[PDB]
Design a protein around this ligand. Structure first.
Ligand SMILES: COCC(=O)NCc1nc2ccccc2[nH]1
Ligand SMILES: COCC(=O)NCc1nc2ccccc2[nH]1
Lengths: 179, 245
């Protein structure tokens, strides 16, 4: 197996730690959802190729501009995360996270991931957002942002229900394998 | 790690580690607070273990089996002894606090009611100064350590065979040289996340909520200080490149 490195970036409200935990755990966290994620080396077989994918989180590093880039050396694929229940986290992608990722990781594929897709049709989420003249992120808004920032692709998932989680990581492995 | 501490922290949570008859006696809010405190200790145990892999497995093994130029091993594992000292002492205090709280006749049933005081002591005074100085030095030497590792693996056969040999066991899957370095750098930024979530479930005793709020502000001050003192070192950097920053 070849070794590839994945790093997930995005605002704290995007659920990046939850996504890494749910993919790596083996049996969903039914009793306790961990606060933090250390690291993990996933054994993935995608399109007949065996890869060891090391997974890393940037959670806790958002306010520390000189510590955060130490997570970037030799990254093969970037997961740029936002939450579908937070249009504000999508708005932080093009001029906060994207210029940083392109400076420290030139030529590294970025996959824009819209997390918490289950909240798109949640009435509590729709009510809370409507109080700030907002609504859940629409699929076309996610796709247009991925297009605008030069992302390799756009994907959606729900860490809560596990839907679309496996597909994100298999695609991230394919992206890390490309020239 | 030592077997005693590994078995004590083997379960996914405090609610799964204690006896179910002991769990049944506590309020939901106490269980939530205890699960987060258990995660802080469990991850501190793993962090100290990462530092022992660096000093005993990698560093010492290189000194005892390889012929490397003097100062190369230090460049690969900067401040590892100072870091292992700070965190082994902090882990000793966390584990002693759990041990004192055990019920008589039990090695697993306990409740930690007073974590704040221990966190204020760790993140203040001389111990805070030593963490600030050690992490400012470590994180400034981080990129240099990775580049030095990559050079040795690619150009030295005996170094490449040493790495493959000592990292072959499955328990070392996520603990290579570069992984251990990033695991250490990322550790200090996990503290505010764990402490804020412990604070969330610690409003029952007002002295405890205040101690945890003070500890949170202390950890944040330390992180801000470490962040401001970082400047990446580059092997063979010229003075002109440094003073034109
Ligand atoms: C520090 O934040 C990272 C994390 O994963 N905290 C635990 C956590 N995250 C949750 C999301 C939904 C429901 C319950 C949850 N519990
Ligand atoms: C099936 O699970 C029922 C249960 O009791 N879980 C324990 C539990 N729930 C928590 C919520 C927040 C913080 C820590 C927690 N720990």
């Amino acid at each position: 197996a070849i070794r590839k490195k994945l790093v997930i970036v995005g605002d704290g409200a995007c659920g990046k730690t939850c996504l890494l935990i749910v993919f790596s755990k083996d049996q969903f966290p039914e009793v306790y959802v961990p606060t933090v994620f250390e690291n993990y080396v996933a054994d993935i077989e995608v399109d007949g190729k065996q890869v060891e994918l090391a997974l890393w989180d940037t959670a806790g590093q958002e306010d520390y501009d000189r510590l955060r880039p130490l997570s970037y050396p030799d990254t093969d694929v970037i997961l740029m995360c936002f939450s579908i229940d937070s249009p504000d986290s999508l708005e932080n992608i093009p001029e906060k996270w994207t210029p940083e990722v392109k400076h420290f990781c030139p030529n590294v594929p970025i996959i824009l991931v819209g997390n918490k897709k289950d909240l798109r049709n949640d009435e509590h989420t729709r009510r809370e957002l409507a109080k700030m003249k907002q609504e859940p992120v629409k699929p076309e808004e996610g796709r247009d942002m991925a297009n605008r920032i030069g992302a390799f692709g756009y994907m959606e998932c729900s860490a809560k229900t596990k839907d679309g989680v496996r597909e994100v990581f298999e695609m991230a492995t394919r992206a890390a394998l490309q020239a | 790690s030592m077997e005693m501490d590994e078995k004590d922290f083997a379960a996914d949570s405090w609610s799964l580690a204690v006896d179910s008859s002991f769990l049944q006696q506590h309020k939901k809010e106490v269980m939530k607070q205890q699960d987060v405190i258990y995660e802080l200790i469990q991850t501190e145990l793993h962090h100290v273990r990462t530092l022992k892999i660096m000093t005993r497995l990698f560093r010492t093994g290189m000194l005892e089996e390889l012929h490397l130029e003097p100062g190369v091993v230090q460049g690969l594992f900067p401040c590892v002894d100072e870091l292992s000292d700070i965190h082994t002492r902090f882990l000793s205090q966390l584990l002693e606090r759990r041990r004192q709280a055990l019920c008589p006749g039990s090695t697993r049933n306990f409740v930690i009611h007073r974590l704040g005081d221990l966190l204020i002591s760790q993140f203040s005074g001389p111990s805070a100064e030593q963490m600030c100085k050690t992490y400012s030095e470590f994180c400034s030497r981080h990129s240099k350590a990775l580049k030095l590792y990559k050079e040795l693996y690619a150009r030295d056969k005996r170094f490449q065979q040493f790495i493959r040999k000592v990292t072959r066991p499955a328990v070392l899957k996520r603990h290579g040289v570069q992984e251990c370095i990033l695991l250490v750098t990322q550790r200090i930024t996990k503290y505010p996340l764990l402490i804020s979530r412990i604070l969330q479930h610690s409003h029952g005793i007002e002295e405890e909520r205040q101690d945890l709020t003070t500890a949170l502000g202390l950890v944040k001050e330390l992180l801000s200080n470490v962040d401001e003192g970082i400047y990446q070192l580059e092997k063979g950097a010229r003075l002109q490149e440094i003073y034109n920053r």
